[PDB]
DNA sequence: TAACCGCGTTC
DNA sequence: TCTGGAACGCGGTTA
């Protein structure tokens, strides 16, 4: 009813007054009915701040409520104040006939009548119509409401007669020309701050015209921002409970000044006033406030935030822990923390206010920090971001430390907090804010929403400011056939990755090198043409401003030759390693690859035929089983009773599908039949290149901060990373669910075409050396020392200019076969001249020398192990370290920690012998662990090394009918602890492998860790249940753990980074202790 | 055995 | 409701 318009003008009310309370109340700017100069902006009356934040609400006459758009200033005199801005919501009819468009206006300025509030003719570009290239556009009704309500009003009116769209037979309605509605679900706060080019980080004169940018104020304001760590109660073995534990004490800081709160009945001590400091550049002192309740530390709490005022409170994982844990403490207490300091959940369940953004920073490290999910802890963060090891304090002791040493609690607390407020203020605070500046979302929308919907928020803008009639979101096909199949899954030939060879490469053992005659016969013809690339498009200079082409030519010329009458060769490497440079992005640009450039036989030499690979995965049921599965679904009834015709249409594929699933198993033996088809599609070059522009921008803005390229902050390449995050996501915003531009063929058009390349850099690379590993765009190399390696031309300006001869040789090959000759762009777009021009944009960087790199092999015969290796830098310092466990969360200490001190010893001997024997003695000392049962290690250490940690995704019950070690640890840990400790997700679920059941599968043998540390009588009982031993009376974990099971897993490791390899390199096993696999064994004979 | 799955990594 | 992609290692399951 109109009661929505109520509970939101009352939800307005009180937010109006909290923020008035929080320092916002409204400014109305001064009346002007003179003309709006930008010039003129220190003249025109009004009021000058930092835009801070914004939100939509609802307004009264100043009976229904008027949809608008709060915003949040900072002024210039450390003040602030709210502004806001009205604007009806609006979406857009499109008809099958623009000769009756006017007939189409009459009937629906009836039907809604009690909805609209304009109507207006409005013309726009569609891309997806013909001739629009021309100047031809498409013809729309633009329909306004007051507020948000009413427009959802009209979209509920209108479904009915879209879902339809009677007269005699024997030989139209105004109805049946309605096409459909777009623009319609685009969020409110967002389409004000579009039209309005309004964004978050910008400075503004809020005046009765309108905001007015003021470009001259360079920085960011400086909002007061907070930042907080909550430590409470929890039982011992067990999680927290906001019902009965209660928070021991909050930690936070304001702007550099850190503060404590403690709970003087829990903590057995008033705490006096002390600092830490981790490095210089993050000064604690903290202030303790010693209240005696828990009441007087949330009021303490909850009155410094309304003192302070903060625009920013910053949290770790605030969302889940934190606020809901103060909230439900506080409501136990009367407290209202709403009524208290203006914050409570969200439909999503987060913590928001009106008058201040909640920056969780572990949002941003799960999304834009490219850590390996095994670093997204506090404690890892704060080293690789902040340079220092924070206080750290085992969780099972917190609880208990509170009593016997309460000042070791609290530099735990304040540790947490001074890591967190320095890891906003140097990394999420300046990311988030330039972020909001190009993205119209407030700071909380920038934190959160996913990297696909940033980018569609990008390309949103763009259209708009050309005038492009948006897409509607892609719809999921429910149900696709190929052959008469059902296919599970379609997609497309992504990332080609080659293992080529594994051992031990390093510059100071020589290597065997057979190299092509005709592979150097070539590259002597196309060395004048690629030294002259070189210079005029890898450097953008001019041939005649050199002053050694000739020099480096015959210097070059001379190497070649060399390796041309003498082939085989045995010199010391070259390990490097050759990537493309923003390479999927650079194919797209390069080929005008965007989605609306797609299209099949259309009247429409802007052809751009390209090809991409098509994979999808059947069920091998023919269409007849297909139905006969259906009508035995129909036979059945299933639950909310209903019928399956009462079904979704998506409901009833998942029953299909899955019955299906079983029929397959057993008729055919088999799930899911792959096949893969290789098509074509055309790609037009005249399209509006809006998206195209846009991955053009971004790609841009990165070389930028790559450029900044130091040999003191390094930082700039921390946020090189973030452009790179948005442009992976453009590749992927393609292929995105509910995206409104979508296309495979484009997604695979990159993948196939990026293949093409790096087989083409492979196949000659072979014929000049030895390439180790290839994944997507990169190729790790061994090359000889006797190729011509680094040149830097001498200009006739004094300057020096780079040559990697190995990259420019290939770089030539590739704009000589990879080159779009075809991109046309819009020269005079009035008279519609269209000129066409060659665009190239790929190119490949190196990396090195190396001093050594490492590749695994795998335990089966000629396969090898992809996607893993270790890099050093000719300093000894590790370079790369990919795929392996060490990095790697939740796996056997006991590997990790044997990587981590296997793979520097890699390093030492002067033979590739003696390199093999050092690493072996490492190996050894590890065995002797194992097979010393772990008699010289504490049984701490030991279950520190012999326990592997598991996060299981989704709650077990999710996990019906499937067995694991994850599964049997938490079902273990619910007999033991209860079944509250299996509530939550993202269960850590820690155990060790007994020997006893013997016979018995693996995932019946895990036992968790934490019955280890339980009272001696829960010990007994639980074990003897899970070794299914009554007769137990020793509990030595060295007696339960299946000593075997840890040895072989250590055996695995050491034949696939050591005795493996050796044996592929020539080298007998060094290690003997571990046996070659059989097939290794026939082979030396 | 061959086919498949969950997790967490490299692109 | 909100929601970037595919290729790959490893240790387990099932039938
Ligand atoms: N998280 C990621 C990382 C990479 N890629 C894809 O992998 C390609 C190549 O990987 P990489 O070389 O890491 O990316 P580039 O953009 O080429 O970056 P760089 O300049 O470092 O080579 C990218 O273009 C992108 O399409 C992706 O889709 N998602
Ligand atoms: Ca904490
Ligand atoms: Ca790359
Ligand atoms: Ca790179």
Known sequence: NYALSAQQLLNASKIDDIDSMMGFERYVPPQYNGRFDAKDIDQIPGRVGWLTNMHATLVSQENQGISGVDFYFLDEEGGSFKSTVVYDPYFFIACNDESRVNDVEELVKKYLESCLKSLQIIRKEDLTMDNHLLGLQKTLIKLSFVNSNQLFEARKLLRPILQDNQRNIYNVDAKHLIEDIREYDVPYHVRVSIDKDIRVGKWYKVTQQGFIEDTRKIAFADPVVMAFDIETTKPPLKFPDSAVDQIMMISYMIDGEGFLITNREIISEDIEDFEYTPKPEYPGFFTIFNENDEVALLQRFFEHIRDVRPTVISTFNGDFFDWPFIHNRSKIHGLDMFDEIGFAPDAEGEYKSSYCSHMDCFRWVKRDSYLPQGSQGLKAVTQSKLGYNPIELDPELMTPYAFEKPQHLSEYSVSDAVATYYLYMKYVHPFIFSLCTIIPLNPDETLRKGTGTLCEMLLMVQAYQHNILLPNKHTDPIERFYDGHLLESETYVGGHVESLEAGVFRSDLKNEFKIDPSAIDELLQELPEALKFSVEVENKSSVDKVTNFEEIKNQITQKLLELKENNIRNELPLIYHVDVASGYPNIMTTNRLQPDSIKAERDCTCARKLKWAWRGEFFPSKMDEYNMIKRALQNETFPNVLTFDELSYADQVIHIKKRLTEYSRKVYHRVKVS???????????????????????????????????????????????????????????????????????????????????????????????????????????????????????????????????????????????????????????????????????????????????????????????????????????????????????????????????????????????????????????????????????????????????????????????????????????????????????????????????????????????????????????????????????????????????????????????????????????????????????????
């Not at 390696?789 to 000589?816: A, I, W």
């Open 675 to 1085: 096949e893969i088809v290789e098509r074509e599609a055309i790609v037009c070059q005249r399209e509006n290149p809006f998206y195209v522009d846009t991955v053009k921008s971004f790609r841009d803005r990165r070389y930028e901060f790559k450029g900044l390229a130091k040999t003191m902050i390094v930082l700039y390449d921390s946020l090189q990373l973030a452009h790179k995050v948005i442009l992976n996501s453009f590749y992927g915003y393609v292929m995105r669910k509910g995206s409104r531009w979508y296309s495979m063929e484009m997604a695979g058009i990159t993948c196939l075409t990026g293949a093409t390349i790096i087989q083409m850099a492979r196949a000659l690379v072979e014929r000049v050396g030895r390439p180790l590993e290839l994944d997507t765009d990169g190729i790790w190399c061994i090359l000889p020392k006797s190729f011509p390696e680094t040149y830097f031309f001498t200009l006739e300006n004094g300057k020096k200019l780079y040559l990697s001869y190995p990259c420019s040789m290939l770089n030539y090959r590739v704009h000589q076969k990879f080159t779009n000759h075809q991109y046309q762009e819009l020269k005079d777009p009035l008279n519609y001249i269209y000129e066409t021009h060659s665009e190239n944009t790929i190119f490949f960087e190196v990396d090195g020398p190396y001093k050594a790199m490492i590749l695994p092999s795998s335990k089966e015969e000629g396969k090898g192990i992809k996607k893993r290796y270790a890099v050093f830098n000719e300093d000894g310092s590790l370079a790369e370290l990919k795929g392996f466990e060490l990095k790697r969360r939740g796996e056997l200490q006991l590997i990790k920690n044997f990587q981590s001190d296997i793979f520097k010893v890699f390093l030492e001997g002067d033979t590739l012998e003696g390199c093999y024997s050092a690493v072996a003695s490492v190996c050894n000392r590890w065995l002797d662990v194992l097979d010393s049962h772990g008699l010289m290690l504490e049984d701490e250490d030991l279950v520190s090394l012999i326990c592997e940690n598991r996060s299981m995704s989704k709650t077990l019950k999710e996990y019906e009918g499937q067995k694991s070690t994850s599964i049997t640890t938490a079902r273990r840990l619910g007999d033991f602890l209860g079944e509250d400790m299996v509530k939550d997700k993202g269960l850590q679920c820690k155990y060790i492998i007994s020997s006893k059941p013997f016979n018995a599968p693996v995932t019946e043998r895990a036992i968790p860790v934490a019955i280890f540390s339980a009272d001696i009588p829960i010990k007994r009982s639980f074990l003897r249940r899970w070794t299914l031993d009554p007769s137990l009376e020793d509990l030595d974990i060295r007696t339960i753990i299946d000593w075997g099971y840890y040895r072989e897993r250590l055996g695995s490791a050491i034949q696939k980074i050591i005795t493996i390899p050796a044996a592929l390199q020539g080298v007998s096993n060094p290690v003997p202790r571990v046996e070659h696999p059989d097939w290794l064994k026939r082979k030396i004979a």
